[PDB]
Design an enzyme around this catalytic site. Structure first.
Site, short mmCIF file in Angstrom:
data_model
loop_
_atom_site.label_atom_id
_atom_site.label_comp_id
_atom_site.label_asym_id
_atom_site.label_seq_id
_atom_site.Cartn_x
_atom_site.Cartn_y
_atom_site.Cartn_z
N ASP B 75 -11.74 133.75 28.98
CA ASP B 75 -12.01 132.66 28.04
C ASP B 75 -10.77 131.91 27.54
O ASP B 75 -10.88 130.98 26.74
CB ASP B 75 -12.85 133.16 26.85
CG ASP B 75 -12.17 134.26 26.07
OD1 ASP B 75 -12.45 135.44 26.35
OD2 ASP B 75 -11.42 133.95 25.12
N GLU B 95 -7.04 136.13 26.91
CA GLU B 95 -8.41 136.38 26.52
C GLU B 95 -8.46 136.70 25.03
O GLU B 95 -7.49 137.19 24.46
CB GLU B 95 -8.97 137.56 27.32
CG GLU B 95 -10.48 137.63 27.37
CD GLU B 95 -11.03 137.87 28.77
OE1 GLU B 95 -10.26 138.31 29.65
OE2 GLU B 95 -12.23 137.63 28.99
N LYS B 97 -10.91 138.47 22.00
CA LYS B 97 -12.09 139.27 21.72
C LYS B 97 -12.33 139.50 20.23
O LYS B 97 -11.41 139.44 19.41
CB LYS B 97 -12.00 140.61 22.44
CG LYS B 97 -11.80 140.49 23.94
CD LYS B 97 -13.07 140.03 24.63
CE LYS B 97 -12.82 139.84 26.11
NZ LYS B 97 -14.04 140.03 26.94
#
EC number: 3.1.21.4
Lengths: 261, 261
Positions: B75, B95, B97
Site C-alpha cells: 500500500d 507498507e 499497518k
DNA sequence: TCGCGAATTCGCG
DNA sequence: TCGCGAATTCGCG
C-alpha cells in the site's frame, strides 16, 4: 520402509487424528524405530528461546522482546530429538490451515455474498498469517541445514484440480481450480521459493549469486487438491517421512548415541 | 543532508500524505537530487516477475503459479531506479499497518468485549499477514545486497511506552506498553531477526555458522510508540533515508550514469 | 491472570 | 471481468 508405519497409519485413520495428535503419534513411531535415541514433543516455543538461538549466530541478533512470556504455538507441535551433546534438535514442526467454506455452501443451498445472492465467496487473505510462524521457526533453525516445516492446507481456497458440487436443486456449480476469486494457493508459495508443493523440501539448498553465497529454508506445503479433508494416514506418512529425513541430516551428531546404546 | 528535503517534508505534513503518496513524493525528491538517474514508482508487482527473478538464481526455483495474473500490492508502492545496464533496481518498498482501536474506545465511552463490559479489547493476530509481502519482496531481492523494506505500525497494539487515556467520565484508563493483552509488536520481530526496531536495517548482514555462510534480509520496522498517528514529515524523512542508503549500495552499478550524464 | 490463535466478509479498482 | 487487500471479535487454556 519398515512396515511398522503401516500399523501406525491405520491407527490414525481409525481415529481421525488431527495434526497435533498425528505428530504425537509420529514421536511414538520414531522412538519405536530408534529406541536408543531420545525424542520429545512440545506444543509451544517461547520467543526467548528463539532469540537465544539467534544471538548464538550473531551478537547483534535476537535482542528484542516486548511481551516477556510471548510464544508461538504451532497447532501440530514440535517433535525433537536429543543429539550426542545433550542438545535438542527439532526434527518436525507441523501446522494445519483451513480456508474457503464454499463446497459446504454449494453442498447445501446457502447463497452467500452481500445480498444472499452468490454461489461463491470472494476468498480472503487470512492465510497470509501462516508466514509468521514459518519465519519464527526459520530464525530458530538458522544454524541447522534442514527445515522440517510441514504445512497442511484444506478448503475450497486450495484447489489443484477442477471440481463439481451439486446443489439440493440439481444445480451443478463448478469450482475452477486456477480461479483467482477462489484460489489462494499462491499466498504460500513464497515459503518454498516457488519449488514444488505436495513435496518434502526438508533438506536446505545452498545457492549463490556473486561471491554472495546463501542458504534457503523452504517449507513443505501440502494441499488437499480436491477440496476434501485430509486422510490422517497420509498426513501421518508425510510427517514420518519429513522427520526421518531430518534424522538423516542430523546423522553426524547422532552417531555415538546410535552405536553405543 | 541537502536541505531540499526540509521543503518536501513540510509539504507532506501540510497535506497529511499517506504512505503511498509519500513514496511518490520520495521519488520526486530523489530525481530532484539525482537528475541524471532514472527513477520510477510502481503500485504493484506480478508473481511472474518474482518467479522470473527466482529462477535466475537457481533453475529449480520460482517454478510455481496457480493464478496467472496474481500479484502483490504494497500500500506504499515500489520506488525503483534504472542502473547502468538498463535494469530496474528497487530502492524502496513501504507498507503501513494498523491494529488496536483501544485508544478510540477509551477516548470515547464505548465499552467493548463479549458483553459490553471491557475497557480493552484482546488483541488479534491480523498483523501476522505482514510477513507474506516481506517474504515476496525478499525472494524478489534474493540477489541484491540491500533490503529496502519499511513497515509503519500504528494503533494501541503497537506501544513502546505507557500511556493514559481519560474517559468522558473522568476515568483514567492506562495502556501498559508491555502488556501481552494489547502489545502485538513481537509479531513483527521475526522480520529483522530481533535487531532494533525504529531503525534503518537496509544493508544486508552476512552471518556464518559452520562453513555455512548466509545472507540476512532484515525489514525496517517503525512504530508510533505512543499510540498516535504518524507525522508525514518523519515518515517521509525515513523513506528518503532508506532509499538513499539503497542508492549507496547500488553505487557500483550506477557510476556510468552519474559521471556521464 | 495472560497471551495465542481461528479465518472470516466484503470493498475496491 | 478478477484478484488484492483491510484487520476484525473472541475462544481457549
Amino acid at each position: 520402509s519398515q512396515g511398522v508405519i503401516g500399523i501406525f497409519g491405520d491407527y490414525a485413520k481409525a481415529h481421525d487424528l488431527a495434526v497435533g495428535e498425528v505428530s504425537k503419534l509420529v514421536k511414538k513411531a520414531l522412538s519405536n524405530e530408534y529406541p536408543q535415541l531420545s525424542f520429545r514433543y512440545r506444543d509451544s516455543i517461547k520467543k526467548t528461546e528463539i532469540n537465544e538461538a539467534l544471538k548464538k549466530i550473531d551478537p547483534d541478533l535476537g535482542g528484542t522482546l516486548f511481551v516477556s512470556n510471548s510464544s508461538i504455538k504451532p497447532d501440530g507441535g514440535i517433535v525433537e530429538v536429543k543429539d550426542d551433546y545433550g542438545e535438542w534438535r527439532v526434527v518436525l514442526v507441523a501446522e494445519a490451515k483451513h480456508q474457503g467454506k464454499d463446497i459446504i455452501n454449494i453442498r447445501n443451498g446457502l447463497l452467500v455474498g452481500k445480498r444472499g445472492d452468490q454461489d461463491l465467496m470472494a476468498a480472503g487473505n487470512a492465510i497470509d498469517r501462516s508466514h509468521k510462524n514459518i519465519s519464527e521457526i526459520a530464525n530458530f533453525m538458522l544454524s541447522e541445514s534442514h527445515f522440517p516445516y510441514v504445512l497442511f492446507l484444506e478448503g475450497s481456497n486450495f484447489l489443484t484440480e477442477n471440481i463439481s458440487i451439486t446443489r439440493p436443486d440439481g444445480r451443478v456449480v463448478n469450482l475452477e481450480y486456477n480461479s483467482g476469486i477462489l484460489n489462494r494457493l499462491d499466498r504460500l508459495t513464497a515459503a518454498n521459493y516457488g519449488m514444488p508443493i505436495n513435496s518434502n523440501l526438508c533438506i536446505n539448498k545452498f545457492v549463490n549469486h556473486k561471491d554472495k553465497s546463501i542458504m534457503l529454508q523452504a517449507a513443505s506445503i501440502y494441499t488437499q487438491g480436491d477440496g476434501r479433508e485430509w486422510d490422517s494416514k497420509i498426513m501421518f506418512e508425510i510427517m514420518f517421512d519429513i522427520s526421518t529425513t531430518s534424522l538423516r541430516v542430523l546423522g553426524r551428531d547422532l552417531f555415538e548415541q546410535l552405536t553405543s546404546k
